[PDB]
Amino acid sequence: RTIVVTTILESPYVMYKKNHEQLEGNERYEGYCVDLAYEIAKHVRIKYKLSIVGDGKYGARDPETKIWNGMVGELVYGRADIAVAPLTITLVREEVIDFSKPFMSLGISIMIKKGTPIESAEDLAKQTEIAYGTLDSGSTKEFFRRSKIAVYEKMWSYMKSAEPSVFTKTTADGVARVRKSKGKFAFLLESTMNEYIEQRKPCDTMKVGGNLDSKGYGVATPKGSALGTPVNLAVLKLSEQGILDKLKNKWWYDKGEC
Amino acid sequence: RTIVVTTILESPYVMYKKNHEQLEGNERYEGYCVDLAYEIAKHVRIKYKLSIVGDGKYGARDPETKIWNGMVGELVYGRADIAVAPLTITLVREEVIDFSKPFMSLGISIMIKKGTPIESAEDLAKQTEIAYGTLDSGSTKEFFRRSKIAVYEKMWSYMKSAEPSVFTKTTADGVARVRKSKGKFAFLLESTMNEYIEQRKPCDTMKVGGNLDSKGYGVATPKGSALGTPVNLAVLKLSEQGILDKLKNKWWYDKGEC
Numbered sequence: 210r211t212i213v214v215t216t217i218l219e220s221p222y223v224m225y226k227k228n229h230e231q232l233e234g235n236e237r238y239e240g241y242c243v244d245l246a247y248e249i250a251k252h253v254r255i256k257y258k259l260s261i262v263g264d265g266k267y268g269a270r271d272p273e274t275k276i277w278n279g280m281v282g283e284l285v286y287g288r289a290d291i292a293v294a295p296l297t298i299t300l301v302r303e304e305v306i307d308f309s310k311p312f313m314s315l316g317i318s319i320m321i322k323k324g325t326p327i328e329s330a331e332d333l334a335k336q337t338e339i340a341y342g343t344l345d346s347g348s349t350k351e352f353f354r355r356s357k358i359a360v361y362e363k364m365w366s367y368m369k370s371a372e373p374s375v376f377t378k379t380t381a382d383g384v385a386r387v388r389k390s391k392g393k394f395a396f397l398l399e400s401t402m403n404e405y406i407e408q409r410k411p412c413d414t415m416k417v418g419g420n421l422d423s424k425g426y427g428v429a430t431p432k433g434s435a436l437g438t439p440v441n442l443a444v445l446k447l448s449e450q451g452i453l454d455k456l457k458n459k460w461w462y463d464k465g466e467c
Numbered sequence: 468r469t470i471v472v473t474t475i476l477e478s479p480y481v482m483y484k485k486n487h488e489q490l491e492g493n494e495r496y497e498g499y500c501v502d503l504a505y506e507i508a509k510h511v512r513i514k515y516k517l518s519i520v521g522d523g524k525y526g527a528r529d530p531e532t533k534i535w536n537g538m539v540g541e542l543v544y545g546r547a548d549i550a551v552a553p554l555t556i557t558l559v560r561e562e563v564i565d566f567s568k569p570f571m572s573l574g575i576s577i578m579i580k581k582g583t584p585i586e587s588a589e590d591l592a593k594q595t596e597i598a599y600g601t602l603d604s605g606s607t608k609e610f611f612r613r614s615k616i617a618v619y620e621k622m623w624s625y626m627k628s629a630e631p632s633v634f635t636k637t638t639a640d641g642v643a644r645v646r647k648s649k650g651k652f653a654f655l656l657e658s659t660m661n662e663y664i665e666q667r668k669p670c671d672t673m674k675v676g677g678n679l680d681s682k683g684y685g686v687a688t689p690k691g692s693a694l695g696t697p698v699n700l701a702v703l704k705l706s707e708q709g710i711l712d713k714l715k716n717k718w719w720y721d722k723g724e725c
């Protein structure tokens with residue numbers, strides 16, 4: 210009767226509170242999705258316990274084993290009742306789980322160290338002085354893999370034979386590599402994260418150009434779950450009341466340092 | 468076995484072809500949603516006939532009669548099998564029909580005649596020299612009605628006792644009233660339409676400020692329809708292939724006159 214809510218450690222969605230080591234249960238965490246879970250759980254009238262995904266992944270299906278991993282895997286095999294996180298809505302996933310209507314809108318984008326002579330994906334693909342990559346094992350990576358557009362077809366061929374490995378294990382690791390590499394590495398990541406990093410000290414990065422595509426994040430439940438319909442209406446309710454906007458302001462911009 | 472596809476006359480989604488009066492069936496029309504219907508019908512493998520909604524409305528429920536009107540009404544009473552149009556995803560509607568994941572992202576916005584001293588909704592609400600309104604009987608109107616935010620709570624109180632009537636019967640009628648009124652009338656409309664009008668002669672209007680909210684358009688089917696799942700996957704497929712973006716470019720910007 211207590212719902213398991215799977216999520217992922219990723220600022221500023223879910224983070225350890227300043228004195229987390231001295232608390233317990235849901236009180237250890239704070240962030241955008243901690244609040245969202247609270248508001249949803251309040252319209253749907255349920256008790257819940259937040260739970261961090263063991264492998265830290267979003268959700269992909271192994272081509273040989275055909276097992277699903279990450280948060281998606283937790284719903285498919287029945288270990289979690291709902292996922293509340295920055296999980297992208299895609300065709301492959303929608304075949305195996307359900308999504309609510311988007312609670313956030315976004316697209317792929319470019320992050321550079323201030324001063325780098327880059328304005329577009331066309332600028333990146335036509336040179337090799339500057340190396341670039343993506344988070345691993347996510348929808349961003351997958352996007353370049355499956356592209357039939359010329360410029361992106363060019364970029365993925367570079368990233369393919371990149372030495373050393375151009376991908377990263379974490380968003381944090383990417384940003385760090387941008388900050389350390391003195392403008393010789395650029396990072397391709399979702400614009401929600403790009404926009405957040407930009408308002409954080411040391412204030413040395415920035416988003417350049419427009420977005421590569423359009424998409425959204427959804428709250429997910431296993432196929433045929435009874436919580437699916439109540440969760441969708443709840444999301445639409447919060448959007449219509451200005452709660453969603455109020456929450457982005459709180460965690461992105463009301464605490465901006467630059 | 469031939470699917471009825473309800474839609475609405477609204478540029479540049481659906482329009483009469485240059486010589487429509489000399490054609491028949493689906494050949495009379497052209498636009499963004501005519502193409503979209505074609506691509507969806509091709510992945511879902513069906514034959515279809517486009518049909519223009521009799522009353523020209525989007526979809527609202529009469530508070531005394533409790534009958535639903537517009538395109539929404541056509542699905543609820545079973546006269547159409549699917550709707551393909553700029554129909555906004557809302558909580559009230561989602562209770563009575565189904566929506567696919569959004570094929571377009573947008574929000575409420577401000578249209579002015581070039582030269583008008585307005586930059587924001589805050590600028591509008593704090594004065595009466597300049598009159599303003601919205602399309603009637605749609606989600607935009609409804610948004611100001613239900614708002615509990617101070618500035619919008621102020622704006623809807625004006626529009627309420629406006630003399631003469633500040634609302635309009637058509638998008639076209641609003642734009643026209645902006646162009647004719649020498650900067651004494653401003654129009655609040657969805658930004659998709661604002662952006663399109665801006666790239667049309669006489670090139671005398673423009674979008675000012677940021678969007679009031681975030682939302683999307685969806686393709687709709689009656690509750691429990693068997694076409695619901697195939698239509699959703701088809702939309703996600705077209706989005707992932709760059710078809711959606713390709714189509715917005717075609718009807719908005721590849722033919723821009725300004």
Ligand SMILES: N[C@@H](Cn1cc(Cl)c(=O)[nH]c1=O)C(=O)O
Pocket residue numbers: 267268295296297298344346347348349350380397398399402
């Ligand atoms: N949202 C993604 C994960 N994800 C996240 C970031 Cl910040 C990114 O740059 N790329 C991603 O794939 C998904 O659901 O796989």
Ligand SMILES: N[C@@H](Cn1cc(Cl)c(=O)[nH]c1=O)C(=O)O
Pocket residue numbers: 525526553554555556602604605606607608638655656657660
């Ligand atoms: N999308 C709306 C209709 N609609 C359209 C325009 Cl262009 C507008 O400015 N306001 C609206 O309500 C709905 O579905 O009711």
Ligand SMILES: [Zn+2]
Pocket residue numbers: 225229230
């Ligand atoms: Zn710690």
Ligand SMILES: [Zn+2]
Pocket residue numbers: 483487488
């Ligand atoms: Zn004619």
